[PDB]
Design goal:
This is part of a larger assembly, with one copy of chain A (303 residues), three copies of chain B (379 residues) and one copy of chain C (154 residues). With 303 residues, chain A is mostly helical. Chain A is built from eleven helices and five strands. In chain A, the strands form two sheets. In chain A, strands 1-2-3 form a three-stranded antiparallel β-sheet. Chain B has ten helices and eleven strands. In chain B, the strands form two sheets. In chain B, strands 1, 2, 3, 4, 5 and 6 form a six-stranded mixed β-sheet that branches. The chains are: A mainly alpha (303), B alpha/beta (379), C alpha+beta (154). Chains A and D meet through loops of A and loops of D. The complex binds zinc ion (5 copies). Chain C binds a DNA duplex (31 and 31 nucleotides) through helix 1, helix 2, helix 3, helix 4 and helix 5. Chains B, D, E: It holds the Pfam family AIRS_C.
Chain lengths: 303, 379, 154, 379, 379
DNA sequence: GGAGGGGGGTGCTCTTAAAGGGGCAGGTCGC
DNA sequence: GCGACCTGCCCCTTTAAGAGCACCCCCCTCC
């Protein structure tokens, strides 16, 4: 498929071998976070790695991960390799989410710093470069969907920043639940059409007042019959269904911090405390790297 | 046996005067006669410095777990965590079957404080009293073992292995262990301001147990002959014995269901002592305040009559096989009690909201004049 | 000079109260049961009846308008110290009571009584006043209801 | 205090009259007066009818591990097996710090008998006596905790929990847990005829400890002086103390290297006490015979003075933190004892081939005329 | 500075027995046993017959702006005014630095009563006791002067002169002067019924000072040791020293903001005497009534225990560096306390509304049973 | 000398009802 | 058709007032 776990496993193995060689040549005592008394070492196999070792091991890869040529990986392919690692972990029974689990916060920070000042490359003769990261890549790796509270919250950001074209972090932050409205707007032309979509005003500062054109000033999502698992309307409806009743009807913030503890039959997944600015920026920095979103925003702003 | 209303010594061909609690020497302060000293000793047992390891260059998860209860130990292989606990309780009830069940429930309660619904294996420590006639030991220990095993069966685990030793006082206890994935349990350090505290079992079990011993001694009985009669004391004894023998498996299940942040078991010390212990673990600056105190019927008055012996009001009274002290948001807690009270899965059991999580201090306290909720005698 | 604590119960029927000391038993018996008396408030239209002599002195405060208690913060005048103590809770922002079902915190039991209506609890209450069937939980609450409402007057 | 060679009560602001062993009624039988009743109770608590499950229509490995000790419990994840042991004892040695090491070694002794070399976690139980003076407790208990933690460090394990209780006699113990793959432990049921049993530590520590305790009082010491000199106790006591503080970890590793068919721990029931138990679980029709008892220096003669209080010759002499009993083949035993005597790193110790193995009924037996070897003390 | 740590005589080459307070005959009635007579003398020196000047055929402010303190004395140039004050207190705290700060604060407090928040110049009167040895004089006096200058710096003024004289007792004081426009000071002669008095500092500083000096006299301590523990006395002394060493700049600044009618200070004569003096000044016919009396924690108990020595409940206990008795309207007072507790500039402190203003005959009283408010030792 | 009884008055905690301000929800008039 | 304005009714909170106990103060006392 789009995402290959073997590549991530190989990169992790190479880094682990190099780090083990460095540690053994330094021959400095260092104790692992495991219960048994043993010298700290990064397992050559991902699965056996402890919860803490993966975090520290993953954090350093952002600075020491090499390739056959020896050139440091570019940010996009590095993010792709981390996604491959996550796919490998999911395949072999590990349930940890390296991008959302609270125990993996530092890895997110280092990845955000690496991806902070990245820009698309026009280096190839073609004027548009296709990023390795793709929409189908994140979907396959269970980054996007209704699996966990954090992934769902990320999914809304993905579709919000694609359709509403809210590339900037401030555009997202200004968003609030009250401003977003859902209208069936059922068309009598098609019986039982059951059209549904959410509209949001765009922050276009113009001297003229009033609604010049309904479509020009607003962006509306659309149902996806190709897969019910991907319909932005369905996910948005499921998002509200799993949020506290108090927050609905509030005009302060749209995104809510996930609950650290959730169950499949839990009525509520989200707290009443909006996500922090740093977390918002960290999530955004990763979403822009996608190829589909990147080209969508490139076309929108240019036109 | 469970079906029989009570353990009658004559039926088993033992002397009528025989009392299981006779071997132990009950004290007003319970098994925890020193509170600060035993607390410091327990902290010293868990005291460890090399585990900081430069904090592992970040917010490393604590191998100590809660620090004071149900330590979680990461494993080399599988990315799993070992979660095991241990607790020992001397006999305090006259029915050996029920007392063994109580010991098993007390041992398992610590796991349920971290939302570990299912247990892997359980060990048993069976102390044998020196001052016990050989004939008696052959009629009581089988009952205690059977109760322990039945409780283990009710908890989805089997008691295999253990140890048997001789001690002046009968010692009952064990070790409950579970090898579980990270998402299976709840680390109690996520409490935030605005939350509420939920208690799954009423307080005042120690008073009810102790008073039943005074029902025979005319010297001690006269000190409370006015405040509390005898039939209500017997009812409170029956209810405390039945309450101490339940299991918090449903509590753990609803804990996972309803977005719980932190929890702890009210076993030994007291509700206030355990609340103070819990507050220290919180990452944030949150201080607990306890407004209510569910106490068995006609037990607060006995505490007042007995003076400093018990001290229910101050929350320092020891408890055995006590309930959980969860920390849920308001709406989840409101739904929590409704579901546990009348669940379709099993039998109904009440739960009360007793406090509010205040911000700033990382300390626990009880308002100067707490309200007493006299738990109805199962009517 | 505090004597050691002993508990003695008023053996008279209808009074199951237990007192903190034998000393207080004589006072309880004399002032409550044995001393059967009736007084009338001097106010022209009060028409109330108080058997004790202590109660009348308090009642005189109600008819007059002498306010000798001043709040520290808002300088508001109150007729009794405990009324001020309840008032100060507004300025300190403390809510001691708390409902045991939905975790709803209030400042006074009057607010809590209102909240219990949502969590309908009068069903499990057994006590009630004979006149208007108030459906209280405890006993002395019926006495308080008979005092504030259904007052005993001429 | 680790470097200190002995316990100096005067050095801790304590009167010389203080003795750690003073808090326990040391009987010749040791911890448990009965063995038939205690064995029956342990078998009762290690027996579960639902456990058999018609052998799962196959050859299911026992869930009780050795059957009598160190139970192995299959897990849901990855085919791992949870192996854990529990053992509690009372002080028998005056030195506090060395007592903690002995207690730690006792808990792990069962674990090493299954072949497990490395341990994950180790809880502990600290029984603080109510008779102990407040001033002593704040200074004596920390010595036990520190020694126990040091022993855990020696064992490559960390103490990350436990429990504290009040008990007329100081109670020390803990539970050690190891989650290991099937190729990391040895099930002791493969013994075959034509093998030899190897005991890795000298027998008869209880005799030395008890007589050393009698040293002070002259009522009993008068008769013991006739059979042995006083100065023998001082060195014998030190040897027993030191032999009860060295872990069998090295011996555990050599079982893997030398095709150890079975092994056990000599503690509590005695060398003949565990010989029968180890035999009853062998799936092959075999019997053990002990042709040699390597008694501690002159302890065999001392046992002759007291007719039955010790009973070493019959083999039912209680031992604390005793060595293993490995049923290697004849060829392996030759190199096994040599290897443990002169390890590459050092710290070797002598191991004695107590006897042999012959086919027949599943029972153990000490020959009618056992030989005695007096181990040479090291100084 | 001595703010970092308590003044230790040894650190400055002074003997342990040394105490600064030894150079004054402290008494419960303060530095003036016949308070009434000193009032007569102060009136005698203030009163001047020529100042009436036939009323100048009009109604204008008097030279003695209020006839009791902080004379205004209008000048010639620019129609300005010269508000000037003086005060002298003998040492009452062991710390020399804090004592100098207290003297400076007391000197400045008179101006802040009139709403003046700026001081152009200040003088200092430093008196050295005859009994003090030479070695002490050069070690304590520099600290006193440093504290005085530090206090002056915080007040936006500088000590630029003074005088030094020999005295049997240490005499510490100064004189504050300010030349201000007619609209920069509140002349405390306005007062209307309906206003509410406001106090900025708790009373009972003299009691705390006296008790702290009774911790060395065995005869006096035993009389009072029953009612108050030593820790309470220590914390009360610390709070009183911190309060007495605090400037009223914020209160004076807020006086203008919240439309203050009249104000004074509680330095000497107690709360009742100063209110009585203030009442006479009011143009209207208004009499004050004081219902609340904020006192330092536990000092009231000592005050009543000692007998007719302090009489805080009678509002006669003398105070040093006391607060301001500000007359404000009801809503302004409600706001006044809120802002002074958490100022925008920060470093707020609590204030109380201690009474009301009613139509009368220019007098002040205290209700029969004042509601004593125990101010806690915050931080 | 004296601890114990009698008589009186009082603060404190609890309880209930009454008063009151805020806010949701009608009917009427104007645009 | 939509809104502003007046008014009515309910909700929830705060103030006002009674009940009774524990307590102190004073006085008297006959042993
Ligand atoms: Zn009565
Ligand atoms: Zn009246
Ligand atoms: Zn107020
Ligand atoms: Zn409620
Ligand atoms: Zn009624």
């Amino acid at each position: 498929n789009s995402l290959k776990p073997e590549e991530g496993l190989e990169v992790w193995k190479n880094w682990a071998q190099t780090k083990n060689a460095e540690l053994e040549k330094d021959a400095q005592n260092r104790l692992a976070p495991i219960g048994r008394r043993q010298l700290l070492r990064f397992q050559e196999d991902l699965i056996s790695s402890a919860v803490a070792e993966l975090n520290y091991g993953l954090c350093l890869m952002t600075r020491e991960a090499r390739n056959g040529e020896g050139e440091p990986y570019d940010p996009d392919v590095l993010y792709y390799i981390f996604l491959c690692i996550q796919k490998y972990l999911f395949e072999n029974g590990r349930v940890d989410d390296i991008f959302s689990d609270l125990y993996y916060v530092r890895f997110t920070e280092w990845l955000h710093e690496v991806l902070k000042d990245v820009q698309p490359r026009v280096t190839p003769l073609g004027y548009v470069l296709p990023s390795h990261v793709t929409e189908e890549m994140l979907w396959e790796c269970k980054q996007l969907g209704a699996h966990s509270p954090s992934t769902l919250l990320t999914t809304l950001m993905f579709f919000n920043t694609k359709y509403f074209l809210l590339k900037t972090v401030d555009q997202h932050m200004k968003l609030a639940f009250s401003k977003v409205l859902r209208q069936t707007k059922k068309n009598p032309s098609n019986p039982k059409d059951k059209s549904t979509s959410i509209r949001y005003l765009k922050a276009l500062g113009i001297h003229q007042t009033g609604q010049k054109v309904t479509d020009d000033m607003y962006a509306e999502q659309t149902e996806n019959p190709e897969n019910p698992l991907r319909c932005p309307i369905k996910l948005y409806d499921f998002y509200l269904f799993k949020c506290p009743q108090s927050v609905k009807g509030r005009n302060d913030t749209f995104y809510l911090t996930p609950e650290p503890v959730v169950a499949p039959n839990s009525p509520i997944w989200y707290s009443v405390q909006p996500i922090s600015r740093e977390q918002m920026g960290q999530m955004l920095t990763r979403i822009l790297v996608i190829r589909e979103i990147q080209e969508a925003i490139a076309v929108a702003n240019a036109s | 046996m469970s079906t029989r209303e009570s353990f009658n010594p004559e039926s088993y061909e033992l002397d009528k005067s025989f009392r299981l609690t006779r071997f132990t020497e009950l004290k007003g302060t319970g098994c925890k006669v020193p509170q600060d000293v035993l607390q410091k000793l327990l902290e010293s047992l868990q005291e460890n410095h090399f585990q900081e390891d430069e904090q592992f260059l970040g917010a490393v998860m604590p191998r100590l777990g809660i620090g004071m209860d149900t330590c979680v130990i990461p494993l080399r292989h599988g990315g799993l965590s070992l979660v095991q606990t241990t607790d020992y309780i001397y006999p305090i009830v006259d029915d050996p079957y029920m007392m063994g069940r109580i010991a098993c429930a007390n041992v398992l309660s610590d796991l349920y404080a971290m939302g570990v619904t299912e247990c892997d294996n359980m060990l048993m420590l069976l102390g044998v009293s020196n001052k016990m006639t050989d004939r008696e030991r052959d009629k009581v220990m089988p009952l205690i073992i059977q109760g322990f095993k039945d409780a283990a069966e009710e908890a989805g685990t089997s008691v295999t292995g253990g140890q048997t030793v001789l001690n002046p006082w009968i010692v009952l206890g064990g070790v409950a262990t579970t090898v579980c994935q990270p998402n299976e349990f709840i680390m109690p350090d996520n409490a935030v301001p605005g939350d509420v505290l939920v208690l799954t079992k009423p307080l005042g079990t120690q008073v009810a147990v102790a008073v039943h011993q005074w029902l025979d001694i005319p010297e001690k009985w006269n000190k409370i002959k006015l405040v509390v009669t005898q039939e209500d004391v017997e009812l409170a004894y029956q209810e405390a014995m039945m309450n101490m023998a339940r299991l918090n498996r449903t509590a753990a299940g609803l804990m996972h269901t309803f977005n719980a942040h932190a929890a702890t078991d009210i076993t030994g010390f007291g509700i206030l002592g355990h609340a103070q212990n819990l507050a220290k673990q919180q990452r944030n600056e949150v201080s607990f305040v306890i407004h209510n105190l569910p106490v068995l019927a006609k037990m607060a008055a006995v505490s007042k009559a007995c003076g400093n012996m018990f001290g229910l009001m101050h929350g320092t009274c020891p408890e055995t096989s006590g309930g959980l002290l969860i920390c849920l948001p308001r709406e989840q807690a409101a739904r929590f009690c409704a579901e546990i009270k009348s669940p379709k899965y099993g039998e109904g059991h009440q739960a009360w909201i007793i406090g509010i999580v205040e911000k700033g201090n990382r300390t626990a306290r009880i308002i100067d004049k707490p309200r007493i909720i006299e738990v109805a005698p199962q009517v | 000079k505090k004597p050691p604590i002993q508990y003695v119960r008023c053996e008279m029927e209808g009074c199951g109260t237990v007192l903190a000391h034998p000393r207080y038993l004589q006072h309880h018996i004399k002032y409550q049961h044995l001393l059967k008396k009736k007084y009338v408030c001097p106010h022209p239209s009060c028409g109330r009846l108080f058997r004790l002599q202590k109660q009348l002195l308090r009642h005189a405060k109600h008819h007059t308008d002498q306010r000798d208690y001043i709040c520290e913060y808002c300088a508001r005048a109150f007729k009794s110290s405990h009324n001020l103590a309840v008032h100060r809770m507004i300025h300190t922002g403390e809510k001691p009571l708390q409902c045991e079902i939905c975790g709803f915190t209030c400042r006074q039991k009057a607010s809590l009584n209102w909240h219990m209506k949502k969590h309908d609890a009068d069903s499990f209450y057994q006590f009630s006043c004979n006149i208007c069937g108030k459906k209280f939980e405890k006993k002395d609450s019926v006495v308080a209801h008979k005092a504030k409402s259904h007052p005993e007057v001429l």
